[PDB]
């Protein structure tokens, strides 16, 4: 069985704060004596293009209010870095977890802690898609909601801060250095993301999960090698497959080769008509190899 | 948009402990000075039917080890209540959240904190099905993983302790009184659960969600009243619809009566062939009214 799960949120919850500037409110992340939040918090109320360099030069520290669970923190200084602010506050978060900052790549899975007014309301796993957007569930006020991963040694990787929802409904964020994923503008615009490609590495993982569950009506005995599949993938809305050897644990157990699964993808590309694979009516790219392995075997 | 989410797990993570008896290890929940865990932990290693009353009668307190993040709690006494043990320990959990215990009904959504050796590894939302099982993700050692909801005032409702995986893959748990949901046996056996019905109230909530996203190709123009739908529901594997007036909010905003969605359920029952509703190719009973309302309007 396959269930999308999030990693536990407790150590990240203790870092979420409410950041207010004037009347504008969003979420920030408090590590040590620094709060990171989207710079949208200092935007003037207007319908014209936002000049953030001008808003930054006219910023006054006393217009900020930063709080953790209703306890207000004193603001010492603020610098702007791409699409985020770094707010120095006058005391350190005594529950700062061991952490690093990591910039995601397309195909990476991570966890979103969806937050409103400095308070977490939900947690879910997501994948950064090839168009550098995610499909989240955010209502008004989710700006600044953090994305994270928890390494095996317990280190939190801070990798995402929610920035904006595009007209299409797709969600855009930045890393903690202020670079927006996909170079989208961090203010209202008419921007549209590129077409989403199916994540081939995840699809291969999904088909191995199907095999391990005894679902194999779809298996091809044809073989397509990596170079051939990657050329087909270009023309058919799929990514290249990154490598084959990482699947060897699943390959030995099944015992089906990655190249057989690549041929199976080409066979199943259009539809299942109208059978299903693990309940899905079309190929699923939601689950990574690491998830299939960890959910099947704890590794 | 509709995404299955879990409520934040921080306050529950601080209650999970490792419970060991002899060589057998599983998870427990530490509230005040009590640890609740599945009684499977005192089972003898064997392939015969387990007699839990005899296992309990021959129990020795010194065979228990209860620990939280590597520090060991002193065990004071143990009682058995249905499928769970209540282990009294000599320390109170200083991180005990404000909490109540609540027994779930089919169609209720809740959150699972999946745990291994007393450490949380994943959190996800699930729905209790009409056969009283859930579709989770558990591998070996997840026994005792807790299920919970968090009310608006912050109170944690403890509602589920993971007990066993059935031969079908479906998951069985107990409440914190030790009653097994669906009264399945809490030991290895050949039991098979009865078939699931489609949770009609959840399907309605799902269709209200689609209307709010401009997904309306499936909307029936005509209506069927509740009494006619419930007759159809029996003969077609759906539960009876509860009431109509709960959906007033979404009935208002759409503005579509529940009776119109009931007619659409009848029409969509076979298949979409091959159109789509919010990503799904068949009707989805995964989301309750409360989740839809919370995810779209707060």
Swiss-Prot record, chain A:
Q: Which residues form the Peptidase C30 domain?
A: 1-299
Catalytic residues, per the record, are: 40, 143
Described function: Responsible for the majority of cleavages as it cleaves the C-terminus of replicase polyprotein at 11 sites. Recognizes substrates containing the core sequence [ILMVF]-Q-|-[SGACN]. Inhibited by the substrate-analog Cbz-Val-Asn-Ser-Thr-Leu-Gln-CMK. Also contains an ADP-ribose-1''-phosphate (ADRP)-binding function.
Q: What is this protein called?
A: 3C-like proteinase
What is the native source organism of this protein?
Answer: Human coronavirus NL63
Which part of the full protein is shown?
2941 to 3239 of 4060
From Swiss-Prot, chain B:
Active-site residues, record numbering mapped to chain? 40 (for 3cl-pro activity), 143 (for 3cl-pro activity)
Report domain Peptidase C30 positions: 1-298
User: Could you tell me what this protein does?
Assistant: Responsible for the majority of cleavages as it cleaves the C-terminus of replicase polyprotein at 11 sites. Recognizes substrates containing the core sequence [ILMVF]-Q-|-[SGACN]. Inhibited by the substrate-analog Cbz-Val-Asn-Ser-Thr-Leu-Gln-CMK. Also contains an ADP-ribose-1''-phosphate (ADRP)-binding function.
The protein's name: 3C-like proteinase
Name the species this protein comes from.
Answer: Human coronavirus NL63 (HCoV-NL63)
Q: Which residues of the full protein are shown?
A: 2941 to 3238 of 4060
